[PDB]
From a paper:
We show that human and Drosophila Pygo PHD fingers associate with their cognate HD1 domains from [name]/Legless to bind specifically to the [name] methylated at lysine 4 (H3K4me). Therefore, this is a prime example of histone tail binding by a PHD finger (of Pygo) being modulated by a cofactor ([name]/Legless).
The latter is virtually identical to the structure of Tern1 (with an rmsd for the Cα backbone of 0.16 Å) described below. The same is observed in Tern2 (data not shown) in which the methylated guanidinium group of R2 is not able to assume a stable conformation, due to lack of molecular contacts with the PHD finger. In fact, there is no discernible R2 pocket in the Pygo PHD finger; instead, the long hydrophobic side chain of L358 protrudes into the groove corresponding to the R2 pocket in other PHD fingers, blocking access of R2's side chain and redirecting it into the solvent.
Numbering used by the authors:
A (entry chain P): 1 to 7
B (entry chain A): 338 to 398
C (entry chain B): 174 to 203
The structure:
Amino acid sequence: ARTKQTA
Amino acid sequence: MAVYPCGICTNEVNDDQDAILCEASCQKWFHRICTGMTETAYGLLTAEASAVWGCDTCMAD
Amino acid sequence: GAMVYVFSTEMANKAAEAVLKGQVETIVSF
Ligand SMILES: [Zn+2]
Ligand SMILES: [Zn+2]
Protein backbone atom coordinates (compact mmCIF):
# COMPACT_ATOMS: atom_id res chain seq x y z
CA ALA A 1 0.00 0.00 0.00
CA ARG A 2 1.09 3.56 -0.73
CA THR A 3 2.08 5.42 2.44
CA LYS A 4 4.52 8.13 3.48
CA GLN A 5 6.84 5.29 4.54
CA THR A 6 6.93 3.92 0.94
CA ALA A 7 10.49 4.18 -0.46
CA MET B 1 -4.34 25.85 1.82
CA ALA B 2 -3.63 22.12 1.82
CA VAL B 3 -2.55 20.14 -1.23
CA TYR B 4 -3.52 16.82 0.37
CA PRO B 5 -6.17 17.52 3.03
CA CYS B 6 -6.69 14.52 5.31
CA GLY B 7 -9.89 12.66 4.38
CA ILE B 8 -10.80 12.64 8.06
CA CYS B 9 -9.48 15.75 9.83
CA THR B 10 -8.92 18.00 6.69
CA ASN B 11 -5.50 19.16 7.94
CA GLU B 12 -2.62 18.88 5.46
CA VAL B 13 -1.03 15.44 5.10
CA ASN B 14 2.74 16.15 5.10
CA ASP B 15 5.51 13.80 3.89
CA ASP B 16 6.94 13.56 7.41
CA GLN B 17 3.66 12.29 8.95
CA ASP B 18 2.47 8.67 9.01
CA ALA B 19 -0.25 8.67 6.38
CA ILE B 20 -1.85 6.32 3.84
CA LEU B 21 -3.63 6.77 0.51
CA CYS B 22 -7.13 5.31 0.02
CA GLU B 23 -6.14 3.41 -3.13
CA ALA B 24 -9.34 1.36 -2.77
CA SER B 25 -11.53 4.23 -3.98
CA CYS B 26 -11.51 7.89 -2.98
CA GLN B 27 -7.75 8.54 -3.42
CA LYS B 28 -7.59 10.90 -0.43
CA TRP B 29 -4.59 10.77 1.92
CA PHE B 30 -5.38 10.09 5.61
CA HIS B 31 -3.18 10.50 8.66
CA ARG B 32 -2.53 7.06 10.22
CA ILE B 33 -3.65 8.34 13.61
CA CYS B 34 -6.92 9.74 12.21
CA THR B 35 -7.77 6.32 10.78
CA GLY B 36 -7.13 4.44 14.03
CA MET B 37 -4.48 2.34 12.27
CA THR B 38 -1.72 1.01 14.54
CA GLU B 39 1.97 1.66 13.81
CA THR B 40 2.37 -2.06 13.13
CA ALA B 41 -0.57 -2.20 10.65
CA TYR B 42 0.92 0.89 8.95
CA GLY B 43 4.34 -0.76 8.61
CA LEU B 44 2.69 -3.99 7.36
CA LEU B 45 0.63 -2.16 4.72
CA THR B 46 3.76 -0.27 3.64
CA ALA B 47 5.70 -3.56 3.28
CA GLU B 48 2.91 -5.27 1.30
CA ALA B 49 3.61 -4.37 -2.37
CA SER B 50 0.35 -6.08 -3.44
CA ALA B 51 -1.91 -4.67 -0.73
CA VAL B 52 -4.05 -1.55 -0.89
CA TRP B 53 -6.00 0.20 1.81
CA GLY B 54 -9.50 1.64 1.77
CA CYS B 55 -10.94 4.13 4.29
CA ASP B 56 -13.99 3.18 6.37
CA THR B 57 -16.41 5.08 4.06
CA CYS B 58 -15.07 3.49 0.88
CA MET B 59 -14.96 -0.01 2.38
CA ALA B 60 -18.56 0.34 3.60
CA ASP B 61 -19.69 1.05 0.01
CA GLY C 1 2.10 -9.85 -9.02
CA ALA C 2 -1.07 -8.70 -10.80
CA MET C 3 -3.37 -9.36 -7.81
CA VAL C 4 -4.39 -6.57 -5.44
CA TYR C 5 -5.50 -7.36 -1.89
CA VAL C 6 -7.74 -4.78 -0.22
CA PHE C 7 -7.53 -4.08 3.56
CA SER C 8 -9.81 -2.00 5.74
CA THR C 9 -8.18 -0.45 8.82
CA GLU C 10 -9.85 -3.06 11.01
CA MET C 11 -8.46 -5.89 8.86
CA ALA C 12 -5.00 -4.32 8.72
CA ASN C 13 -4.97 -3.91 12.53
CA LYS C 14 -6.00 -7.54 13.06
CA ALA C 15 -3.57 -8.81 10.41
CA ALA C 16 -0.71 -6.86 11.99
CA GLU C 17 -1.30 -8.39 15.43
CA ALA C 18 -1.55 -11.88 13.92
CA VAL C 19 1.67 -11.35 11.89
CA LEU C 20 3.57 -10.71 15.13
CA LYS C 21 2.27 -14.06 16.46
CA GLY C 22 3.49 -15.80 13.27
CA GLN C 23 -0.04 -16.20 11.87
CA VAL C 24 0.37 -14.80 8.36
CA GLU C 25 -2.30 -16.66 6.36
CA THR C 26 -5.49 -15.17 4.98
CA ILE C 27 -8.05 -16.96 2.79
CA VAL C 28 -8.83 -15.31 -0.57
CA SER C 29 -12.50 -15.10 -1.61
CA PHE C 30 -14.88 -13.33 -4.07
ZN1 LIG D 1 -6.02 13.64 9.70
ZN1 LIG E 1 -11.62 6.20 0.66
